[PDB]
């Protein structure tokens, strides 16, 4: 056996900060308790971390939610037992259900005092099992590197999501006696049928005379999927519309982009999945938001498929995920952006497909997407704001990253901004979260420093989590927090003076009562340096 | 007919629940709004017969609903939509669970026929919450929607009182009733016994009776003795009666008049040394309504000295914590409050040797103008006008060095007066607890002793109290100066601490939130600021810097 000592003489603290830093952690968002002391105290005395502070555990969750959306690299949340561990039941439900990795440590009692009632005890592995891919409870010092580099690489792989590695005080306030194995220490067949499906589907690709492209999250990760797939869109000339979480995975400026798809999405981009004789799935769960009624979803892929000339291929990293919801002429099981790369010489470049861009061009100006216009002297009408602070903001030149509240305001941000760049549309599809704004926006922010980070928000919503306000100042991200107020069966809501809020909580507040002051407001509001809030006072829903 | 009933034929599951609501006495629901939830929550919204109270987080309805039972002694009802909605009160529920609190729990879900289909908003609450919760189910028909609630009020509300919770599908409460349901699962299952269960207790009644009068006593009461309107009152007639010393746990704090000569106060570390010396000092301690937290025994080995020879009795409702982690002697299963009535008469009336030895022990055991601000005087001061205003008090706290301090000096009279998370100290309890004390008892004097840090939790609620017209007396005493994690300290005792936590301006905030905010910096205008903070009407913060070296 391969035996190793570098942790010999460590606390279990010291270890956990070893290993934070073998996976490439730099970043930990957390609250202080009794029972995560001993690693608390090891992470925040530590230069090699950045320790961000929230005012409630559930922010610390969001905050390395939005963490993890923006820069590509897992979440990494402490906090301590009991309620420290059940206020970050939600974050971890809303990381399950978007695929988002995150990486939850929980303080817990001492071992010994397992089962007995003890304060602040609660059955965590049993709370978050449905919430998370994998849970485990330390049970001693030298078991600590294992758990750490397993709960990584399972919140990594796959499908990405949360796992939870509960930590009793004993356990990390020991100092490991015993040498432990060295590969306990270290990060991390159909292999045919695979590459059988590659080649099937390239097959299928070639043969296509109206593909379209149907992208989701799953393209977002891995770092190339984005490139490689406007490869493939250039090469084959073929058509894209994305999901919701897909925004940002093609450039909706691009000539070849159809925007986003579903019952909410362009007409266009409809049309042509309805018109399609190939539909080409890229990490998307075909959610019955896009599909609708699933039995008429698709009718001419279905025929060529039925003809033996086209159909539904779909590139799933989970084999639960396939065959799921529609039956799929080709799977191509894995990573979507690895087999992307290995069909691409395999694609046959067309030169053009001028009917079939024709016909969408044509639909483009047909069914030109467009909102009810405002009168004017009237009130503002909130997908106004959201198509002026988009070119606002485009004009400032910097890269922007926009997180949402839940509610009619994420649709509208969805519909009416235009999406360019990967990473850059953080908002909370698969538990719709409300009060995921804020936190979501300040823990992207901690992720790209030289970002605009704007937190398109509904005022329900931000009233849910507005006390990480001050969470904001604190950790110095000069977040741009937008509230879309329409308050005026029916369930009238008392909301506070938004601005005095923003003022008590240490940032700059800015209100929009009227049409003829927008405008400028935007414009303050985006170049404001530090923390601020504009609240624009909207036409009632 | 007795048989089948008939009278929810027609009615659609929210109204059916509406009704139900009714039958259990139900007046007051705090909740929030969700898709999945709404078919309940128009119904109950739109009914005058309820008191619908909307909190801007759902962990807010959580404690409100808390803070609600254990004011009123009702059980805390809960209205929330599906997903975020359900997993935002897991925290609500688990410091329920821990404290023995009664709260039905009602959460709206996806439609049966989505069920594990991964649909949106969809969340397994049942497994979630299976740890924190005495039980819970998910109903599966509209026929079956009045039988699993009066099973989820009985539950809550019987043994040790707990969460329970009821997951209900959309298609369920959208439905209308077409078939008529035994009237056995639409009938509240309220509360007779065998002469085989009367002597089977009555037996340790005079065993536990006998062991009591030859013997010379100390009375080790806890929050099992609140679980009774009138179980303080026999409390008192049980210490009259054979002169026995009193000390509460901290949840039984207001089970006994702190005036009173024969009280001990409280008991455990963080209690009055009297107390801990006189379980000692003791022959045999009677335990009511308590369960011997380790924080009120650590050396268990070295507990009751003198009580550990000629034999600790033990008024417990469940079995399952009897001799689970002290050793008794006799066990008077079942409701304290009852099996104390049941043992009135055979008490001896009367003791002067035993006070006389306490009185010295407890005989035995502030600032300066000019300097900082303590705590300890802050609460004092507010008890005494509190008391001055002649007016029921209650009082919730947040968790921390503010919670201990609150329970030590304020002076303890009246039952349900403290209302505090003590299972699972759950930072953030104390606004939310103290809008939903409020709406239990809207003519009592309701203050939150309250932390800056625990604060911040759910300042959030702020708006909430001003919406529900709850006059809550927010008090904050910041010692933001202290970091809220200890590093190391001084034997003979400085503290040398870390991460402090930016709070915002508390008094902006609340104007900002719409109430009156009132702040402390010195001394010399504590006392002026005290009296206008339990003068004002309406609710109002009050913010008193307060030393860090405390
Ligand atoms: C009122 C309302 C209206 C809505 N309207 C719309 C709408 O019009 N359009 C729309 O798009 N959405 C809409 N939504 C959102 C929708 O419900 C779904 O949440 C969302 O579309 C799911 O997007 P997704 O499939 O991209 O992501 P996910 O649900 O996260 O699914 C990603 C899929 O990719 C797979 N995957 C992950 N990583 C990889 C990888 N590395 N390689 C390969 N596969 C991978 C996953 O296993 C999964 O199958 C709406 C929601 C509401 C409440
Ligand atoms: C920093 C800190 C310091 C603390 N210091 C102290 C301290 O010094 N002293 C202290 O006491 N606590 C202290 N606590 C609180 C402590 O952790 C426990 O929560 C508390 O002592 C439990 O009190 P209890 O047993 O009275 O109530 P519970 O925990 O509610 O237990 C009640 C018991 O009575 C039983 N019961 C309930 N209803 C009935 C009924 N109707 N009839 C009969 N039996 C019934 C229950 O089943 C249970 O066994 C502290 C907490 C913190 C965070
Ligand atoms: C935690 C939580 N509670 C309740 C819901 C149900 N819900 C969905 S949208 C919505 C209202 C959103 O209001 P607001 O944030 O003001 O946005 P608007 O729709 O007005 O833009 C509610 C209550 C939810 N998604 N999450
Ligand atoms: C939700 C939650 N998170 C963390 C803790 C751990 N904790 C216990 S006391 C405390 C600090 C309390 O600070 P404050 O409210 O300001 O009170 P003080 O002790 O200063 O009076 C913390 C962080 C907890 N009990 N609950
Ligand atoms: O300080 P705590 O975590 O023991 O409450
Ligand atoms: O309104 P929701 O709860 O369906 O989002
Ligand atoms: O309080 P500190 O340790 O975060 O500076
Ligand atoms: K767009
Ligand atoms: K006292
Ligand atoms: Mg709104
Ligand atoms: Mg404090």
Redesign the pocket.
Known sequence: PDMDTSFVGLTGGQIFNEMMSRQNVDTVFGYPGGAILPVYDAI??SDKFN?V?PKHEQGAGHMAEGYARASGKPGVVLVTSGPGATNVVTPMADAFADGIPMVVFTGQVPTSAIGTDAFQEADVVGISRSCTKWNVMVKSVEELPLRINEAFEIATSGRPGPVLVDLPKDVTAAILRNPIPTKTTLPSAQDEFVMQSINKAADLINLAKKPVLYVGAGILNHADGPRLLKELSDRAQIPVTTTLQGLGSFDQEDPKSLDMLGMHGCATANLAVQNADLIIAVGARFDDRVTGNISKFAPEARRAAAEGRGGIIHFEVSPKNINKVVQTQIAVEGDATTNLGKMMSKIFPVKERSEWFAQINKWKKEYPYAYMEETPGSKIKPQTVIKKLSKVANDTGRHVIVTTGVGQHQMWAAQHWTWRNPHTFITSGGLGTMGYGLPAAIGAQVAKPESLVIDIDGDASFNMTLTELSSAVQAGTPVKILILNNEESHTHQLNPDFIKLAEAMGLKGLRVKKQEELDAKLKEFVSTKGPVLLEVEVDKK
């Open positions: 925040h005395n320790f502070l």
